[PDB]
Amino acid sequence: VELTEEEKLYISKKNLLFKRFVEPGRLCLIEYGPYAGKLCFIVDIVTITRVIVDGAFITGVPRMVIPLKRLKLLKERIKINKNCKSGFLRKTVNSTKVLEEFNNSKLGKKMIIKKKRDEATDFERFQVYFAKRELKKKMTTIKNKKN
């Protein structure tokens, strides 16, 4: 009593016009208010527009309630229980290594490189400038040769 290959391929190609649901355990990026700029995990739901949120203690954010308008839902997801709490959440987040998945897509890489870039100092800035000028000389040589 199953559906084999039909079911698998169909689901895949079906492709839901809406992904990134708000199912409990989603990964979100707060983008308004003082906490904005950190990763968090949705625990459960209190209503349509108001929702709880609590990342594990890795990201450094306790358990409060934040209006959903400030959230930004992300691609990834974990599989916590509805009644889960900060302890088991910190267990399962490192069990799954979801944040490693996060900082490997385009957005995560952009975020971490932006952090390092605006953290960087004047010496690294000038190192980047000199490296870019060396690469520019190489590229103009290559392009002039290609003719």
């Binding site: 490189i113 490296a131 590229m139 290559i142």
Partner: protein, 201 residues
């Protein structure tokens, strides 16, 4: 605000909010130009806007229509007059602010080859619930007597063909330059390659 000029594409924008942003930019000595005014949108029903403009046309000074409040019909001048009324045009500073603004219906030539900017405070999808009636200002102008719409549309498609040609050519160029850069990345010293790779440059 800090460039010699801005050029603003008017795709799916709201007249009032667009006028607000334009006027606030103008009052600080910054030159702004608007393009494709035929695509300005107005929140409300087409017939409600038609009725309001009908009342505007009804209004006229009785003594002499020559001194009458110029009704105008061109969408570009509609936006221009809205900004003028919204800006303190009766003073010298306000006159400078008003006359630092230039607009042309559809695309002209010297503006199709400069980057267009879109103001995210006036986009219809952002600032309107999807289930409430809206309008297209070009149709309103045609109703109130523009009679120059289909010409603008044909010019638009004629420009669109050349635009697609240019975009495909420049896409080819950019994809070639990216390959050149990635291939030439490894001829530099290891220190410079690591410097690039650390910050993704």
């Amino acid at each position: 605000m800090y460039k010699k000029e801005y050029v603003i594409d008017c795709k799916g924008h709201l007249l009032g909010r667009l006028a607000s942003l334009i006027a606030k930019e103008l009052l600080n000595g910054q030159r702004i130009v608007a393009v494709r005014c035929e695509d300005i949108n107005i929140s409300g029903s087409l017939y409600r806007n038609k009725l309001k403009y009908q009342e505007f046309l009804r209004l006229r000074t009785n003594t002499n229509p020559k001194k009458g409040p110029l009704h105008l019909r061109e969408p570009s001048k509609i936006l221009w007059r809205c900004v003028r009324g919204m800006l303190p045009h009766k003073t010298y500073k306000g006159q400078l602010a008003l006359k630092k603004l230039k607009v042309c219906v559809g695309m002209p030539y010297p503006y199709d080859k400069k980057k267009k900017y879109v103001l995210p405070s006036a986009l219809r999808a952002f600032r309107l619930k999807k289930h409430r009636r809206y309008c297209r200002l070009g149709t309103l102008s045609s109703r109130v007597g523009w009679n120059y719409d289909t010409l603008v549309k044909k010019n638009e498609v004629l420009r669109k063909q050349v635009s697609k040609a240019y975009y495909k050519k420049k896409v080819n160029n950019l994809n070639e330059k990216k390959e050149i850069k990635t291939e030439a990345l490894n001829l530099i010293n290891p220190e410079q390659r690591q410097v690039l790779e650390n910050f993704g440059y």
